């Protein structure tokens, strides 16, 4: 049977980048050129892999990570990058072997006057390790006195909303992002191309 790439790409709702979604693909066949052979995508960079040489390859697990960020933030979904997203939201390893795919979704994810659904972590104390996922909603302690759950001087709520307005320039519009990671362990590799 074919891999559920439909469920990941065409999903009706995408996650907030901070609580990015991870669908694990196992025991199935996948056509990765019927992906690259769509003009629908605005970014489709693959690092460590060739997008054609993919139906010729098997892996033990493939991972489909998806979330929404701003177009000016798509540059940070790449090995070796820094900024609110890459540092506090979703980091890719320096030795990443996978593909980052993204397409503009102004039509689905920005509502007139603001979509305050999608969020990003604005405050952290330390950068994320690769494929780490911080879902804390605890008040951020920027001082030396503790905060004990109340906004205030030195006490910041760590998640904020991308105020998606559909009129903005393309840089400040929502883009949907799917990161395909291909891992090879010493165990029966189950995700093959045809």
């Amino acid at each position, epitope marked *: 049977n074919l891999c559920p790439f439909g469920e990941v790409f065409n999903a009706t709702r995408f996650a907030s980048v901070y609580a990015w979604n991870r669908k694990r693909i196992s025991n199935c066949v996948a056509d990765y050129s019927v992906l690259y052979n769509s003009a629908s995508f605005s970014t489709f960079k693959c690092y460590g892999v060739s997008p054609t040489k993919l139906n010729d390859l098997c892996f033990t697990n493939v991972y489909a990570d998806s979330f929404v960020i701003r177009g000016d933030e798509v540059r940070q979904i790449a090995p070796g990058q*820094t*900024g609110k997203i890459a540092d*506090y939201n979703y980091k890719l390893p320096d030795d990443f072997t996978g593909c980052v795919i993204a397409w503009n979704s102004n039509n689905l994810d920005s509502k007139v*006057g603001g979509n305050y659904n999608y969020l990003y972590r*604005l*405050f952290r104390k*330390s*950068n994320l390790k690769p494929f780490e996922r911080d879902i804390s909603t605890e008040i951020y302690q920027a001082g030396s006195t503790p905060c004990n759950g109340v906004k205030g001087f030195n006490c*910041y709520f760590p998640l904020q909303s991308y105020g998606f307005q559909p009129t903005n320039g393309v840089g400040y519009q929502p883009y949907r992002v799917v990161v395909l990671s291909f891992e090879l362990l010493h165990a029966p590799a189950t995700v093959c191309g045809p």
Partner: antibody
Amino acid sequence: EVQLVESGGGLIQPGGSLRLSCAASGLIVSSNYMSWVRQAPGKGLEWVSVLYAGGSTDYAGSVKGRFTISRDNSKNTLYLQMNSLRAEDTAVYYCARDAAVYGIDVWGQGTTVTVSS
Amino acid sequence: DIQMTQSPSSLSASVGDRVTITCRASQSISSYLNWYQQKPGKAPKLLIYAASSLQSGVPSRFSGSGSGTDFTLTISSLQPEDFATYYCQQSYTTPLFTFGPGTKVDIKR
């Protein structure tokens, strides 16, 4: 108390360098977006560079590859290393703690840097 | 990127008036807007954050409104120490913030 205490500017010839110093007390600079901001005579506030709590850095087009923001958490101090200085950089330099959505709420007193031959 | 414009540039007002400064972004930046006061020789004081939130210790006469592209700093009764220069700054692209050009409020005569 809550304060940023700057020091370290003055006269310098073009091509020389300085090292500005923002002594923090009342917030932790390692837990914060700490920015440097400069204001040319009569000209308003221009952002110069950032120190992310996690340690990443950004710089303004002009200073990129000549200035270097850094910190020392033992002394709780933000630093700006201005090398290959030019006469354009002549301004007052503030240090501030950027609380983003909440504002830039803590500014240092400013130190003045004059670059002239 | 987002440039910022300020309407009056220079504004003349007297003690006790209701003064209104304007700010505007090249893009819709939600309520990601902050107001500052500055006087000659001193540093900026944060007045309004998040477009409406009055900052700790700033007198209650300082209202802030707006959202999207256009914003307004209102002073309900101008005081003698209020004569200064007021900037807006945008947080949308934080930590790379851009400021407004300023509005100077001088003493009418």
